[PDB]
Amino acid sequence: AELTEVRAADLAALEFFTGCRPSALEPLATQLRPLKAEPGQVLIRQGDPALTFMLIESGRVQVSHAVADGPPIVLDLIIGEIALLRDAPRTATVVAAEPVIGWVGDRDAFDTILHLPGMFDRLVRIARQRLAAFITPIPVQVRTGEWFYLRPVLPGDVERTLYRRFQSVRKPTRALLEYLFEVDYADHFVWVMTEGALGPVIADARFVREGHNATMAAVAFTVGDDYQGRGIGSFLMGALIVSANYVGVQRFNARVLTDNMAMRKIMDRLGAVWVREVVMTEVDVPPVDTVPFEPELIDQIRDATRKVIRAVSQ
Ligand SMILES: [Ca+2]
Ligand SMILES: [Ca+2]
Secondary structure (H helix, E strand, C coil), X not given: CHHHHHHHHHHHCCHHHCCCCHHHHHHXXXXXXXXXXXXXXXXXXXXXXXXXXXXXXXXXXXXEECCCXXXXXXXXXXXXXXXXXXXXCCCCEEEECCCEEEEEECHHHHHHHHHCCCHHHHHHHHHHHHHHCCCCCEEEECCCCCEEEEEECCCCCHHHCCCCCCCCCCCCCHHHHHHHHHCCCCCEEEEEEECCCCCCEEXXXXXXXXXXXXXXXXXXXXXXXXXXXXXXXXHHHHHHHHHHHHHCCCEEEEEECCCCHHHHHHHHCCCCCCEECCEEEEEECCCHHHCCCCHHHXXXXXXXXXXXXXXXXX
């Protein structure tokens, strides 16, 4: 009875929960368990089913990946939630590098957090800060001569937004799925182009698989009103082609309003025979041999592609 209330108060003292009233945390406190881990203790084990996530109050952890052809790949607030939510087995071991204090919850407790005021966006900022370490923006020069920066979308980028793959989560809520959507790279890959390495997004492009691992994918493109006709579209399409090739996608398709000529031109470059409703097309995914980028720039795009996909456990 009372110990749930000490728990709520303890939760409310996390900066993660700043601004929450303790009384609001009591049902969550019911569903969480305290974690006290010793240095060296395994928190999450590669090859386990994912049964919980952890919310860390203090102490560093270290992630490693064990393989069959050499030593474990090491690296270094929320842990284990993505495989929890996908119901995918753990692809990595997480060990305590210090004493680790925090709390353990199951998928329902994670859903409880997602539905608390302000907490969806905080959780997403946390996924975002974590993915940022796996992303190094690539300066790229478009046909105009201007320099811009290319990078995968990050969780939280507005350009992320825009029921067919997620039919593999049991008894989901919208929040669970929207959260998974923010950390999806394999079935939904989005390249983004920004002004400066840490500046605003000025265009994006995406393929969305038809369903989980489908060979066909729907593509879309967008270019800020100040950046029309600079070759930004055809460039992103280049990266988009490098990424599709890498993950298995062999065909693209596109549905467009007829007056949206700029999109249409992007597709026309690919052998688009448009068929009315307002218009649509379907085309093959040209070989990586074929993208008008130096072999060096190809490698970096594939490298960025692999990096984020692995960081998100696909
Ligand atoms: Ca970044
Ligand atoms: Ca499930």
